[PDB]
Every structure is written in C-alpha cells, then in structure tokens.
C-alpha cells in the first residue's frame, strides 16, 4: 500500500518534533514532520554504511527498497496535487562543495528516485554560496521563505548542507467572520498576560476529549480546510496550570488518528487566536537524539555513496517553516484557546502530518 510510507514518514517526523518541542519549551514552534522525513529520505541515498543504518533505523524504511521512492513521489503529488499551489509550497535541497569529485553515475540515480539533483556551490565564496542557497529556497517557496541560511551559518570550510523549507496558508472550509474577530487576553506559560486578536465562529465542530494517563483532560477540535482533504487539529489542556509539555511529550502520529476517530460534531462557539509563525529549526540535536549522530561528525559520517574521494559530513541541517491562520474570508458552549495550544495540519486520506507546532504566544 502506498499509504504505508505516509505513516512511517509521519511517525518519524512527529518524533523529531518532540525533540524540538522539548528543547524549545515556552518558545513558538512551527514544524513540518513530513518535511523532515522527505529530506532525510533523500539523505539516505547520499549516505552509506553505518551512517545510513542510523537513518534507516530511525526512519524505519529504506529508500532503496522496491516501491518506496515511487510511493513517496505519489505521496508528494498527492499532497501538492489538489491545486494547492497558492496555499502550500515546499522545497528540498542538498548542497555540496562544487569542486568535490562525486561518485560518477550517482546523480542520475539520485535524480531517478527524487526527480531533483544534489546542488553544488562553492562555499569558499561564503556569501555568494549563501546567496545562491537562499535564492534557491526563496524562489521555490513562492518567495515566502527568506534568508534560510543566515549570516555565519556557513563559512569557507562548509562542505555539505541540507535545507528544507515550507510555507502554508490554507483557507478553512468555513471562514471565521471578520466581524467576530475581537481582542482578548492570552495567558502565557509564565502566568503573564497579553492582549491579542482572536477569531470567532460558532458551528458544528468535529470534537473529542482526551485524558492523559494521569487524569488531566484536553479539548481537541478539527477545523476542515477547503478541498476536504486537509484539516487543522487544535489541542490544549482544559486547565491552564497544565503545561503543553504534557501533551507534546506523549505525542504520536498514531495518536492523532485516534483523536480523529473518536470525534463527533457538536455545536460550539470557538474563539481561536490568529497567528502568523515562522520558525527555523536546527535539526542537529533532534536527529542526534534519535540515533543519527554520525552524519554530523567529521571523519565519522559515511557519505561514500555521494563521494568516495574526500570525507564529508553535514555542517548544517535546517528546516524553516512559515504558517498563517487567518479568517479565510470569501465573497452555545464555548472553547477559548487563550492558552498555549498545539496545532496539527493533517492530510486525512493518507494520515500525513504536514505541519505541527505550539503557539506559546500568538
């Protein structure tokens, strides 16, 4: 089944998010579990030996195996296929030093599976190479992701860099009335307060409750998007004294599908803060925590499939995401999301977790 890789990719990506959320407590995070899986699958082909095994053990599948790469191409045209061009955009890219002799015949093999190539720049001209990468990412995210490689992120000794960038601005199936958008207090992790704009809409919302093994319970809503393929899942503890760390530290891609399963449509008035969040995640510590340590370590990383002439290791592995949730305007019991909540964008036919993050301060 082609949906067999969608669950492995999302289970791996959500696990990466947990490491990010654990290290980024109290800070806003927008992340793409499918994005880190898609680009780490590309890195599998460039690695070999022990480095490649660490990746395959953590991801749970081999990009070489039969049908895996064609299924991922089918999954990509599945998520970026319902005319979502102006709503969602992404790009994967690996950049290696340009005068470094690569394995002859590897690029046509890399291209056969991903229909892209590993890009080559001269990192010895640091700012030109930084510019070329930033321009490639920006022109491939419809101009929405700027300066992914910040000043100083690479120098003249950089030899290999992995980048991943996604933009999302999906319109809800039923818009929030612009008239109902009001100012309301938001309660933050430190007990302080800030007034922010919040949308509002009463509707029959797909909803369920969820109680962690210790007895604290949560509200979980589903907001459908136009096209009836994607939806955003909102989740927050009912009690403001319970930190979102409790939810994210047991979070699973499987658990999200269980939430959706036990959901029923109830008439609710929902107020939900507008947020426009942009996050750059340094994937080093998260991927190391999941056993992928060799790829970042000099003279330990095995990239012999990409180059058996010179040693290589990943100087930078970065994901930059930008998400926007607005009224989506076109032409009763209450749920107040006035505390740190969790959001999940999900492709319901495939179970793919496209986006995931915490709103600690909108």
């Amino acid at each position, epitope marked *: 089944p082609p949906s067999y890789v969608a669950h492995l990719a999302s289970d791996f990506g959500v696990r990466v998010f947990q490491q990010v959320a654990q290290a980024s407590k109290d800070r806003n995070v927008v992340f793409s579990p499918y994005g880190v899986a898609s680009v780490l699958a590309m890195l599998q082909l460039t690695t070999g030996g022990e480095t490649q095994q660490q990746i395959q053990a953590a991801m749970g599948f081999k990009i070489d195996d039969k049908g895996m790469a064609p299924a991922l191409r089918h999954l990509y045209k599945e998520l970026m296929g319902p005319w979502n061009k102006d709503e969602i955009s992404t790009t994967d890219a690996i950049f290696v030093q340009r005068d470094l002799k690569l394995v002859q015949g590897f690029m046509p093999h890399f291209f056969r599976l991903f229909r892209s190539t590993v890009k080559q720049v001269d990192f010895s001209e640091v700012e030109r190479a930084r510019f070329i990468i930033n321009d490639w990412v920006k022109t491939h995210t419809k101009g929405m992701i700027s300066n992914l490689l910040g000043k100083g992120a690479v120098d003249q000794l950089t030899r290999l860099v992995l980048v991943n960038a996604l933009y999302f601005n999906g319109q809800f199936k039923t818009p929030f009335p612009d008239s109902s958008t009001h100012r309301r207090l938001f309660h933050k992790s430190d007990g302080s307060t800030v007034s922010v704009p919040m949308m509002a809409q009463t509707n029959k919302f797909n909803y369920t409750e969820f109680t962690t093994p210790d007895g604290h319970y949560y509200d979980i809503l589903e907001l459908p998007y136009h096209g009836d393929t994607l939806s955003m899942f909102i989740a927050a503890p009912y009690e403001k004294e319970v930190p979102l760390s409790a939810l994210t530290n047991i979070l699973s891609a499987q658990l999200i599908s269980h939430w959706k399963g036990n959901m029923t449509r109830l008439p609710r008035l929902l107020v939900l803060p507008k947020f426009s969040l942009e996050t750059e995640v340094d994937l080093r510590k998260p991927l190391e925590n999941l056993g992928m340590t060799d790829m970042f370590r000099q003279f*330990q*990383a095995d990239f012999t499939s990409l180059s058996d002439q010179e*040693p290589l290791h990943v100087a930078q592995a970065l994901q930059k995401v930008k998400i926007e949730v607005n009224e989506s305007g076109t032409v009763p019991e209450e749920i107040i999301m006035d505390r740190p909540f969790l959001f999940v964008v999900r492709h319901n036919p495939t179970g793919t977790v496209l986006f995931m993050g915490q709103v600690m301060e909108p």
Partner: nanobody
Amino acid sequence: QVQLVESGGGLVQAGGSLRLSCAASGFTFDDYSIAWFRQAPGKEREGVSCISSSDGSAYYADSVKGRFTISSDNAKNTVYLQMNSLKPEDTAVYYCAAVWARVCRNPYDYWGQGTQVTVSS
C-alpha cells in the same frame, strides 16, 4: 595480532608544540585511511585529522586547521600528528585509527589506546 601504539603525549605550556607518533604492529598503514581522534573533558570523541587513502590528501578539523599537520611515513610504518601552537582547548586523549576505506569514516578497523596531551596556560 594487530596493534596500534601511540606515543609523544605529555604536558606542555600553552602555545607550545608536540609531535604525536602512532606505530603499527601486525599490519602496514599502506592504502588504509588514517585519522587522529581526540576526547577532551566534557566532550565526545571528535575527529582531528585525516589522510584519505583515495589520493593521500590531508584534512583537518576546523579548530586545528592551519595549526596541526598529519603525515604518514611508510618506510617507518608510522603516522604522525604535528601539533603547533597548542591551546588549553587541545587537552584530550589523542588516539590513532585506521580504516580499510577510501576516506575516513565510521566504523574503523583498528585503533590504539591513546596518549594524553595536557596543555597548561
């Protein structure tokens, strides 16, 4: 029985210089990829220098490039690490490792016990 024996470590003042040697018994370094590693206090084992058998080129970690040199004398079956202008940060257990591969990468076939390099300010 293959054995790698490092020597040359010791105590030296900051900015000083020291030459590490690793001798091989039971095999020859020829066409092996050779790398010097180190383990400083509070840190992982990290690569210091590497000679890739693909073409014999030398590579260095960012923190020692321009200061250290790696070389191999096959007539003496010995690999060297010339450490110049040493810094307190260079304090670590320094050990040599060889791998039957065209470039330095895990896993390594053989490695020595190591020699202690201590740099005082």
